[PDB]
Design an enzyme around this catalytic site. Sequence first.
Site, mmCIF file in Angstrom:
data_model
loop_
_atom_site.group_PDB
_atom_site.id
_atom_site.type_symbol
_atom_site.label_atom_id
_atom_site.label_comp_id
_atom_site.label_asym_id
_atom_site.label_seq_id
_atom_site.Cartn_x
_atom_site.Cartn_y
_atom_site.Cartn_z
ATOM 1 C CG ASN A 150 -8.571 2.978 0.776
ATOM 2 O OD1 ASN A 150 -7.352 2.989 0.950
ATOM 3 N ND2 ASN A 150 -9.318 1.913 1.023
ATOM 4 C CG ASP A 158 -7.479 0.117 -1.665
ATOM 5 O OD1 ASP A 158 -7.178 1.106 -0.946
ATOM 6 O OD2 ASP A 158 -7.130 -1.053 -1.347
ATOM 7 C CD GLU A 205 -3.157 0.758 0.426
ATOM 8 O OE1 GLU A 205 -4.408 0.619 0.366
ATOM 9 O OE2 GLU A 205 -2.555 1.831 0.110
ATOM 10 C CG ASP A 222 -13.172 -3.947 14.540
ATOM 11 O OD1 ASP A 222 -12.871 -2.734 14.534
ATOM 12 O OD2 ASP A 222 -14.109 -4.415 15.234
ATOM 13 C CG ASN A 256 -6.338 2.873 5.245
ATOM 14 O OD1 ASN A 256 -5.333 2.142 5.309
ATOM 15 N ND2 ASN A 256 -7.323 2.671 4.353
ATOM 16 N NE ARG A 303 -4.374 0.811 9.965
ATOM 17 C CZ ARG A 303 -3.479 -0.039 9.461
ATOM 18 N NH1 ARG A 303 -3.729 -1.346 9.473
ATOM 19 N NH2 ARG A 303 -2.338 0.418 8.954
HETATM 20 MG MG LIG Z 1 -5.786 1.847 0.547
#
Ligand SMILES: [Mg+2]
Length: 307
Positions: A159, A211, A17, A127, A109, A107
């Site tokens: 994302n 994504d 990523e 989660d 991202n 978290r």
């Molecule tokens: Mg991503």
Amino acid sequence: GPVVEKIAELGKYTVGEGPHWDHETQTLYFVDTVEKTFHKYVPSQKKYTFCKVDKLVSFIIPLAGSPGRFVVSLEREIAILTWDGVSAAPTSIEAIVNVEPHIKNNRLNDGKADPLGNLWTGTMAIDAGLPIGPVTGSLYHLGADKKVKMHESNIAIANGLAWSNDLKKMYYIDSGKRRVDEYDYDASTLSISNQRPLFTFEKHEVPGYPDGQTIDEEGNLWVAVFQGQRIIKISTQQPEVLLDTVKIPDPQVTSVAFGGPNLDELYVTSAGLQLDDSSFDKSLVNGHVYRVTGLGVKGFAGVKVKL
Ligand SMILES: [Mg+2]
Ligand SMILES: [Hg+2]
């Protein structure tokens, strides 16, 4: 059509990523968001290195004006990592701000600097899940005096981000919505408004989930399709226009970044993590890194974070 090459020298990643192309050093940086590791690849010298930490990581961006230092995520903290680019651990770590000190199971991202050098990043539940899971994320930017400002909430999986060349639009992906959103972007106040869908996966029979994304010099968006085995090219001039599809052998495509000496090679990360609700059998899910050539477009070099 375009040529898709597996980068043998790079191996397989659980969830590769956050690719960042540093144009002056011709170097690709990226992360594994489950294995707590940073990665560096120099294509012209076939050089690969990694760095391990003990917190979840999701982005790595060079610090403007500070060779050898990077802005990274460590769980919910934005931090500066000092790393020589070859040792297996950081030299030192300087915390900047914890974005969500009291949300223990969140978290950071995806994160990226806008064309002015401001860091934007989003959070999510550790989660989180698709199609349905806990929705606890927000979108932030890191502003003056190392304080963050919040711009959107009720984000399931924070994302990919991108900005138009004229700095009037921002594009954002919450993967749970299965669409790309566009916003009016005010560069003078760093505020976004007039949220509206640009591209909705269901309207075009695109499987999987959006994504990461990146924009090219013509203003088209290139979007990684997780559980879609592809990258797609979509218009920013008109809503709901699918321009092209490029198949990638790995089903779980995670992100994209233009690189190479002329910024006309697209680097593509994927996830080898095997999930229980997959549309693809385990033998297909590997997590390689790919390079796509022959797309006929150029991108931009990755922007460094200004602090
Ligand atoms: Mg991503
Ligand atoms: Hg690092």
